[PDB]
Nucleic acid binder design. Structure first.
Lengths: 136, 169, 105, 96, 197, 191
RNA sequence: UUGUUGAAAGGGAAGGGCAUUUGAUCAGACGCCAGCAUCAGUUUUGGUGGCAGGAUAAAUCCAUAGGAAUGUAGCUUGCCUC
RNA sequence: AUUUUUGGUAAGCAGAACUGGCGAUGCGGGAUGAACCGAACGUAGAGUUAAGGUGCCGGAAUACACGCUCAUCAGACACCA
RNA sequence: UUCUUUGCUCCACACAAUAUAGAUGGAUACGAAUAAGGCGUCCUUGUGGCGUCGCUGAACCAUAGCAGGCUAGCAACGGUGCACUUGGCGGAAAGGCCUUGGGUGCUUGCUGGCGAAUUGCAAUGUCAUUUUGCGUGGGGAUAAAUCAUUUGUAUACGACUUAG
């Protein structure tokens, strides 16, 4: 060929820098960066800007994120907060397809009954133009 | 679990003033246990029982730095079915208490040794690396460590799914 | 236009029972789209009705109605306990009931 | 205790129940394996049992004691007047 | 939620699925299971073969008819495993099992209906990667079931025709997604992206 | 211990290709093409240099990391199978009755007929697996050389030929008769 | 114990208990069945506010002293596309 | 029947000591069981629990957490098989 | 299946019943893997490059009007029913999928104009899906079995096989 070929398997590595969305807990949908892994199943995470305390947490309650940033290992809350704000983690997260789908769920949950009648009207106004386009 | 300082003295009977105040570092889920264990251990070392002595102080001890990752080298003794055996295990955790309850779980899992059949001889934090004996701890003490989590099993809150759920991460 | 719904779809699972013995006074109702006792506590005190069709016109219509109210939550997984004015007949284990949004909040 | 002197069972346990074959026809339950190369032809053939007679024939069985010797064999005859084709059934293979 | 649920029985654990389906039927939800010949059991082929042969040998001595009938089909192996988890002797149980149908492969009407899964009874979601499992397609035939490759023919035909259908549906949904994307940057689209829809 | 991570290095020679997708190792080389699907093991391959490929196991075990080194072995055996290939020499060992072995054809299938093994009237038929070539080698009396690419093709052909000529109902230590694999090696000379 | 008529039920018995549905039926002619509000007794489930104590938490945080490694930037020697 | 205990290889055997039980006792649990566990009972409502459990049968988490185990005769709750 | 006409059936209506394992917006169609893919894009068409996506369906589609009345239009050249035609495709239980042109209705894409009370402060407040014989008014077709008799390939009696 002779560029051989391997797939390969792309994964989210459990490292120092890996920001992780907390899914079950008092936090439940806040970002926190991993500073030091304990043992294969347990991590150390601090989200100083999001406001989750530096805690040793089980891995069933975290979701690994595609986003990373160069943090030194076991760096304290002040060092984390500076390296976090430097790399701009919160912007890279808010500008995600996933963060948008979380913001869509919480918004459509926080919708009113009048705004439910409005969105219904507008979707049918949109639907008139798209069905004219689907015909041609 | 909790770690408790327990200082019990002995009953002050005149002709014996100032008994020698014996301190312990009992691992217990509350004070009523921490003080019962204190007496249990000091009945194995000295001729004194809860009647012949008194607890002068009980104080919960917290972690000096409860967010620093620590290699806890714990020495333990346990009654097996056949005899008794002295063990050395190495827990890696963030608190002395969290490391100890992991030992109690991994002693119960690996040798069927229940709470009554275990003595915690010592729980000493290992100062400098290259003193870590056990490989299952020396694994996580490698420069610039990373590792994936293959076969990510997400869990539904509803009986039926429509997508054929994936196990990617 | 298509929809006319002003109740939630309940289903009569079973009675309040032991492993063997049953209590036909408290009927266990599963509400559509509820998960926990916290989610279920919206529906505490609501008016559940069981609408069924007989063959005899009684007093205008062949449809008859057995009235009840939600008493409290049941289990960990969002089931409720309902008491009906007359107890349910038990042949309706898996029959739908209507959870109205009566006494409101 | 056991039979004391053990003998093999009376009767085959395969030809049960020993009831009256519902029909009077014979009911061919298996046909050959259906070769798709060679020309089309009938597999089985209906007919009527007439009776039994004796035959005599020479015997080509090398190694046999009666090699090249007249042997009497019983024979049964079946009347097979030409059978008239009157239909054709199509059968689809199904999970039943 | 639906009037009738349709479950693709492929890559599913027999007992776990059977428990899920058994509760649905008692709660009064009409369910059909299809592709019952791609069900799975924990443990190697041989273990479940021996478990079956231990079941085969269980017959009424004095008349082997009226004894426990050993049904060989993967659909009927599931039915046995599900009828175990319902009080079939009671009128509620008879009515509960009446709400169920099980098929070896996806026949008519269900051939062009939407097929769900039950994540808490998927082999892929449940069994530890490294453990060995059974396929009810191989087990069922080794114990008596004759129609292994009749169903393989009929599935291979249905999957050719359903691949053609999908290739047409997807080719179309490209046009629908493109026209919906060219509906954005409109007064209506910005008002909808404000309300969240 | 459950080994956090362990990997094995697989070297790739100078004119061979390695095509891996989801677990189907397809090696191409001067000899030809070898395929082998390893969908039973649960490992991960990664091309680093186009000449080294790292195979890996995450959160391993005693029984798990054993297989990781096994799959390195099977994949190196495939690369060997396309680069150099395999060649098993078997000797006829007979005491009295000379073994009559030749390759005959039955409906174009390549069999090995074994007749007059301990004066046995039977004609033993060893079907030659495709990709395996048989040579009744001269220069060594009573030798047969099974060469080709895949070791499992060559080795099982040689083994199935040895197994059919096992003497029955005798002292197998006096009746030391049958066709035995003397040598297992590679086709290419200068070795 | 039996006949007929009338009514009902019935997959290896039937009969019984608690509960309701359905069909038939029938006293209470002088009452029947509800909804809401504010209360009392009982009790389940939240949501928030004010205090107490401990190593007057331990922490984090800030100051400061010393130190080390899984040694940061530089420093240096090697392969050299600089 | 737990504990002490005699005879006896032993016994769902024979005979003692203290206590508690069945007899004379329903009820919840151990699938079933006189004796085990929990609790002793007028007729009802409501609330809360015991022992025991909460995949499905079956009311109740296919709960959470750390480990162990793969068995071509797995293992699975005391008295108790 | 009758011609004593009045009986059988298929379709349409109205009618008197009869129920309900339990409608109350929609059962919304790739297969295969899961230590892997989906979709879009490119073209040395591959076990290929480059994007992107997942982390639940909390989605998607439907989604207003007497339980949906009557009317004036503006904007589209659409969407969506009821009955009819075009070519087809489906045999695993295909009894359903498409797909033509047409017609005839509606349209909440958008501005209008009337109506609704008194179900009295809630009472399912009745609208679905079957089993139907009952008269209407149209199409269509115009038999068998059993016993008694007979046979013996069969037979305790039934049954079986024959015959007229």
């Amino acid at each position: 060929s002779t560029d051989s070929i391997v797939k390969a398997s792309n994964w989210r590595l459990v490292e120092v820098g890996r920001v992780v969305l907390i899914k079950k807990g008092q936090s439940a949908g806040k970002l926190a960066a991993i500073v030091e892994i304990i043992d294969q199943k347990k991590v150390l995470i601090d989200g100083p800007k999001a406001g989750v305390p530096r805690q040793a947490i089980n891995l069933g309650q975290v979701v690994l994120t595609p986003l990373t940033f160069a943090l030194p290992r076991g760096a304290r809350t002040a060092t984390v907060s500076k390296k976090w704000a430097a790399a701009a983690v919160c912007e890279k997260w808010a500008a995600s397809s996933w963060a948008k789908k979380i913001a869509q769920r919480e918004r459509r949950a926080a919708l009113t009954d009048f705004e439910r009648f409005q969105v219904m009207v507008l979707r049918k106004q949109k639907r008139y133009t798209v069905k004219k386009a689907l015909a041609k | 679990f909790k770690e408790y300082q327990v200082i019990g003295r002995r009953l002050p009977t005149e002709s014996v003033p100032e008994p020698k105040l014996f301190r312990m570092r009992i691992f217990a889920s509350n004070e009523v246990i921490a003080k019962s264990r204190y007496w249990y251990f000091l009945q194995k070392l000295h001729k004194v029982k809860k009647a012949s002595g008194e607890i002068v102080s009980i104080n919960q001890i917290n972690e000096a730095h409860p967010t620093k990752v620590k290699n806890f080298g714990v020495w333990v003794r346990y009654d097996s079915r056949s005899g008794t055996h002295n063990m050395y295990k190495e827990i890696r955790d963030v608190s002395r208490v969290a490391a100890v309850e992991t030992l109690y779980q991994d002693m119960a899992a690996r040798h069927r040794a229940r709470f009554r059949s275990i003595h915690i001889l010592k729980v000493a934090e290992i100062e400098k690396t290259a003193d870590v004996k056990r490989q299952y701890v020396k694994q996580f003490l490698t420069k610039d460590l990373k590792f994936p989590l293959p076969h990510r099993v997400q869990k539904s809150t509803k009986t039926f799914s429509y997508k054929r759920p994936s196990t990617f991460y | 236009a298509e929809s006319h719904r002003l109740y939630v779809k309940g289903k009569h699972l079973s009675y309040q029972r032991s492993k063997r013995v049953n209590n036909p006074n408290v009927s266990l109702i599963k509400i559509e789209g509820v998960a926990t006792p916290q989610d279920a506590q919206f529906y505490l005190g609501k008016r559940i009705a069981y609408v069924y069709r007989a063959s005899k016109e009684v007093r205008g219509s062949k449809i008859r109605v057995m009235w009840g109210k939600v008493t409290r939550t049941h289990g960990n997984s969002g089931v409720v306990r309902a008491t009906f004015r007359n107890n349910l007949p038990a042949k309706t284990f898996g029959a739908s009931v209507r959870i109205f949004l009566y006494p409101s909040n | 205790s056991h039979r004391k002197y053990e003998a093999p069972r009376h009767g085959h346990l395969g030809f049960l129940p020993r009831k009256r074959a519902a029909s009077i026809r014979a009911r061919v339950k298996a046909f050959p394996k259906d070769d798709r190369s060679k020309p089309v032809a009938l597999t089985s053939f209906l007919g009527y049992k007439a009776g039994m007679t004796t035959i005599v024939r020479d015997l080509d069985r090398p190694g046999s004691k009666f090699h090249k010797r007249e042997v009497v064999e019983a024979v049964t005859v079946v009347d097979t007047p030409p059978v008239v084709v009157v239909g054709v059934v199509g059968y689809v293979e199904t999970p039943r | 939620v639906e009037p009738v649920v349709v479950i693709d029985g492929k890559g599913h654990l027999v007992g776990r699925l059977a428990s899920v389906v058994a509760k649905q039927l008692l709660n009064g939800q009409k369910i059909v299971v299809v592709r019952a010949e791609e069900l799975n059991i924990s443990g190697e082929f041989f273990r479940n073969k021996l478990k079956y042969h231990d079941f085969l040998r269980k017959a009424t001595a004095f008349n082997k008819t009226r004894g426990p009938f050993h049904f060989r089909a993967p659909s009927r192996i599931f039915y046995k495993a599900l009828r175990g988890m319902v009080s079939h002797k009671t009128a509620r149980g008879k009515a509960a099992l009446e709400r169920l149908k099980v098929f070896e492969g996806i026949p008519p009407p269900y051939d062009k209906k939407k097929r769900v899964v039950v994540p808490q009874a998927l082999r892929v979601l449940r069994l530890k990667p490294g453990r060995k499992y059974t396929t009810l397609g191989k087990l069922s035939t080794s114990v008596g079931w004759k129609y292994e490759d009749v169903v393989a023919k009929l599935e291979a035909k249905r999957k050719v025709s359903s691949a053609e259908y999908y290739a047409k549906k997807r080719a179309f949904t490209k046009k629908v997604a493109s026209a919906n994307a060219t509906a954005a940057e409109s007064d209506v689209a910005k008002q909808l992206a404000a309300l969240g829809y | 211990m459950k080994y956090i991570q362990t990997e094995q290095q697989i070297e790739i020679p100078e004119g061979v290709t390695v095509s891996i997708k989801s677990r189907i190792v397809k090696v191409v080389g001067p000899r030809g093409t070898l395929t082998k699907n390893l969908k039973h093991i649960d490992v991960t391959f990664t091309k680093v240099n186009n000449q080294l490929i790292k195979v890996a196991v995450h959160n391993g075990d005693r029984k798990h990391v054993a297989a990781l080194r096994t799959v390195k072995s099977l994949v190196d055996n495939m690369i060997t199978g396309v680069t150099k290939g395999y060649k098993y020499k078997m000797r006829y060992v007979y005491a009295h009755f000379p073994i009559n072995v030749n390759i005959v054809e039955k409906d174009g299938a390549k069999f090995i007929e074994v007749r007059n093994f301990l004066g046995d009237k039977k004609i033993r038929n060893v079907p030659v697996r495709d990709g395996v070539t048989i040579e009744f080698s001269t220069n060594v009396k009573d030798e047969i050389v099974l060469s080709g690419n895949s070791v499992e093709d060559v080795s099982q052909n040689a083994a199935d030929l040895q197994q059919i000529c096992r003497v029955r109902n005798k002292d197998i230590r006096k009746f030391l008769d049958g066709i035995y694999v003397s040598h297992k090696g590679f086709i290419v000379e200068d070795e």
